[PDB]
C-alpha cells in the first residue's frame, strides 16, 4: 500500500519533495493497516473502545500540536500557481508598520524568501503571505 | 454520480470555475460512495467503529487545515452581486493606518485586484474585504 | 413542507426577503426529508453510523464555513427595531483611532449603508454595529 | 407547560420583558415537548440516532449564532444591582485611547445609555462594560 | 441534599457569601436528582438519548453563556490570600498605556475597587489582575 | 489510596507545596473511587449514560473555569531549572512598550517576583514569562 | 516495550535528549499497557463507559495545559535543519516596534539563545521564531 500511497501523492501534486513523499506515505500506510487490524479486532468480539479512544485523543493532540506547520504547508500548496509571486518580482507583502519589501529568490513550503535592498534574506512564512496585502510592483 | 454532482454545482452556482468544479464533484463522489460502501459492510456485521473515527479524524484535521481558503471561498461567493465592488468603481477598504486604496480591476476567489494610483496591483484577500469598512467613491 | 416551513419563516420574521425566504425553506424541507428517510432506514435494521458520521462532519464544515455571514446575518436580526439606527440619523461609529462617520441612508441584512460628508458610500458590517460604541448625534 | 415556564421565568428574574418572557417560554415548552416527543418514539423501537443528531447540529449551529446577543443578555443580568452603574452617576468606562465618558441615564438589555457632554447619546454594550476597567466620579 | 451541598461548599471555602452559597446548593440539588431520575428512567428500559442530548447541548449553552463570570469567580477566588493585594496597598496593575493606578479598599468577587488619586473609584475586573504585571510600591 | 497518589506526586516532582500536595491526593483519591463505583454500578445493568453525561459535563466546565491557573502552574514546573531565572539575575521580560525590569527575588507557582530600580515588587504571571523575549544582562 | 519505544523515539529523531526520551518511553508504555488493560477488562463484560470518559477527560486536559510546551516542542523539531538559522549567524527576527537582534549562540528545545550587541542573552521561544519574520543578515 506504501507505493500506492506513494503514486497517489505524486499524482495528486499535494506533495513533491521525495522525502516528504515516502514520510506521508509510510505515515498513511501505518495508519490505514492500523485502522483495518482495529476493525478486524472488534469484528470478532474483542471490545475496541479504549483502543479507539486513546488512539483518537492522541491523534488529536498530534494533529493540534501541527496546526502552524500544516496551515503553513496548506498555504505553500494554494499559492501554487499565482502569477504575482514569482521569482523576479518586487513584492511587497503587509500594510502599516509590519511591512515587508523585497524580490522574490525561491520558494519553499515553509518560508517565503525575499531579497531586500541591503542583501538581507528575509524569510516570509506562507501563512502571512496568504493573510495579507500582497502588493506587487 | 459525478455528472450529477457536476450538473448540481454547475446549476447552484457554488462554483464556476470548470476545474474546481471537477475537482468537487470527483471529491463528493468518492465521499458518497465510500460512505455507501462502509455503510453496507456495518450491515452485515462486520465492526466499523475503528473505520468511522479515523475518517472523522482525518476529515476534521483536513477541513480545519484548510479553513483559510473555505473562508476565501465563502466571502467570495457571497460578495458576488455587490453594486459597490464592480470594475472601475474607486474602492478603499480599511480604517486607520491599515488601508487600502484602488480601482478594482478584476475579482478572484482567493484574491480582489485593486490598481494603486502608482500602478501597483493590489491583492486583497475576500475575508478582509467582508470584515471591513468597504468606501465607495 | 416547504410551503409550512415558508410561512413559518415569514411569521416568525427571522427572513424577510423572498429569494433568501424560499432558498431556507427548500434546504429546511430537504435537510427534514433526510433526516426522516435516514431514520426510516436505520429502523429496518440497515447500519447508518456511517451515513450520520459523514453527514454531521460535512455539516459542521458548512457551518463553520459559514460563520461571518450567520454571525451578520443574526446582527442584522437583532438590531431591528433601534431607534438609533434611522434613517437621517447622524451616528458615529467606534472609539479612537478607527472611527466611522455619516449618516444612515439604508439599511441591508450583510452591511449598514452611510452617507460620508464628502458624499462616499460607507459599508459598515453589521457584526462590526454590534460589538462597538454607537453614537448618536 | 408554557404557563409554568413563563412563572418560572418570572420569579427567577432572569427575563422582566413580557414579550421576551412569552417567547422564550413558548421556545422552552415547544423543545421539552420535542425532547417527550422523542423519547417516547425512541422507546418503541424506532430509530432516533438521525434526528438526534440533526437536532443536535441545528442547535449548536443557532447557539453558536446567538453567542453575541446571548453574553450581552448575560452581562446586563449579572450588572444588576450595582451601585456604581445607577442612573445620575457619571461613569467612565476604558482605559487609553479607547475611552468613554458620559452620565448613565437608561438602562437596556443590550446597551447602556450616557450622555454625553455635548448631549451624544452613547450606546456602550454590557459586554465591554463588564471587561473594562469602570471609573465612576 | 441541600443542606450537604451547603455545607460542603461552606468547609471548602469556594463560596462564602450565603445567598450565592444557597443558590449553588439547590442548583447542585436540582442537578443531582434530575441526573439520578434520568438514571432511574433509564435502568427500566425508556430511552433517554433525546433526553441526554436536549440537556447537554442546554448546559453547554449555558456554560458557554457564563464564562466571563465563571473566570472572575475563579479569579477571585485564587487571587485570595495574597499579601500584595490587600487593603492599604498601593498597587498599580497594567503596562504601557492600559495602565491603572490606586490603593485598594474593598475586594468583591466581582470587582477590584481602587481609590484614585482624585478620588474616583475604579472597578478592576479580577480577571484583568490575573493576567497583568501587579505593581506594589 | 490517598497515600499512594501523595507519594506518587512527592516523587514525579509536580506538586512541592505540601498543601496542594494533600489536596489534589485528595481529589485524585476522591474521583479514582467514583470512577470506579460508577464502572461497578454499571456493570450489574444500572444505566449509567446520564450520570457520566453529567459527570463529564461538570468537569468539563471546571477545567475550563480554570484554564488560567492550570496554565500558570504548568509553565511554573516547565519553568524550573532555568538558567537564566535565578535570584540575582538582573533579567529583563517583554519588548517594545510592554518592558518590565528588575532583578529576581523569589518565585512562585502563580507569580514571578522582581525588585524594580525604585523598590517596587512586580508580579510576573510565569504564563507571560513562558510566552516572552526573556532578556538577561 | 520501553526499549521498544526508546528504540523507536531515537530512529525516528523526535527526541534527542536521554532523560526527555526516557520519560516519554515511559509514559507511553504506562499508556499503552493501560489501554490493553481496558480493552482485555471491557472485553469479559465489565463496563468501561465511565473508566474511559474520565481517562479521556483527564487526558484532555493535561493536553490543553500543556499547549505551549507541545507547541515549542514543535517548532523546535520543525526548525531543525535550517540554514539561515546557525551559530554565527546574525538573525534579526520580527517586524515593527516587537523586533529582536543579535547572533545565535546555542539552540533549546524551549528557546533560542542570540547574543545582543552589548552582551545579554535573549531567549526567543521557537514557536515566536516559527511564525515570524526571520532576517538573516
Given at each position: 500500500?506504501?507505493?500506492?500511497?506513494?503514486?497517489?501523492?505524486?499524482?495528486?501534486?499535494?506533495?513533491?519533495?521525495?522525502?516528504?513523499?515516502?514520510?506521508?506515505?509510510?505515515?498513511?500506510?501505518?495508519?490505514?493497516?492500523?485502522?483495518?487490524?482495529?476493525?478486524?479486532?472488534?469484528?470478532?468480539?474483542?471490545?475496541?473502545?479504549?483502543?479507539?479512544?486513546?488512539?483518537?485523543?492522541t491523534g488529536a493532540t498530534?494533529?493540534?500540536?501541527?496546526?502552524?506547520?500544516?496551515?503553513?504547508?496548506?498555504?505553500?500548496?494554494?499559492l501554487s500557481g499565482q502569477?504575482?509571486?514569482?521569482?523576479?518580482?518586487?513584492?511587497?507583502?503587509?500594510?502599516?508598520?509590519?511591512?515587508?519589501?523585497?524580490?522574490?529568490?525561491?520558494?519553499?513550503?515553509?518560508?517565503?524568501?525575499?531579497?531586500s535592498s541591503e542583501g538581507?534574506?528575509?524569510?516570509?512564512?506562507?501563512?502571512?503571505?496568504?493573510?495579507?496585502?500582497?502588493?506587487?510592483?
Amino acid at each position: 500500500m506504501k507505493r500506492f500511497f506513494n503514486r497517489f501523492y505524486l499524482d495528486t501534486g499535494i506533495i513533491a519533495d521525495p522525502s516528504q513523499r515516502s514520510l506521508a506515505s509510510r505515515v498513511s500506510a501505518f495508519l490505514v493497516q492500523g485502522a483495518v487490524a482495529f476493525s478486524l479486532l472488534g469484528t470478532i468480539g474483542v471490545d475496541t473502545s479504549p483502543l479507539i479512544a486513546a488512539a483518537g485523543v492522541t491523534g488529536a493532540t498530534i494533529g493540534f500540536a501541527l496546526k502552524d506547520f500544516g496551515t503553513n504547508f496548506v498555504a505553500s500548496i494554494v499559492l501554487s500557481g499565482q502569477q504575482s509571486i514569482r521569482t523576479g518580482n518586487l513584492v511587497c507583502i503587509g500594510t502599516g508598520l509590519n511591512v515587508v519589501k523585497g524580490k522574490v529568490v525561491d520558494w519553499d513550503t515553509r518560508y517565503l524568501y525575499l531579497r531586500s535592498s541591503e542583501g538581507h534574506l528575509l524569510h516570509v512564512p506562507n501563512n502571512m503571505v496568504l493573510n495579507s496585502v500582497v502588493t506587487w510592483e
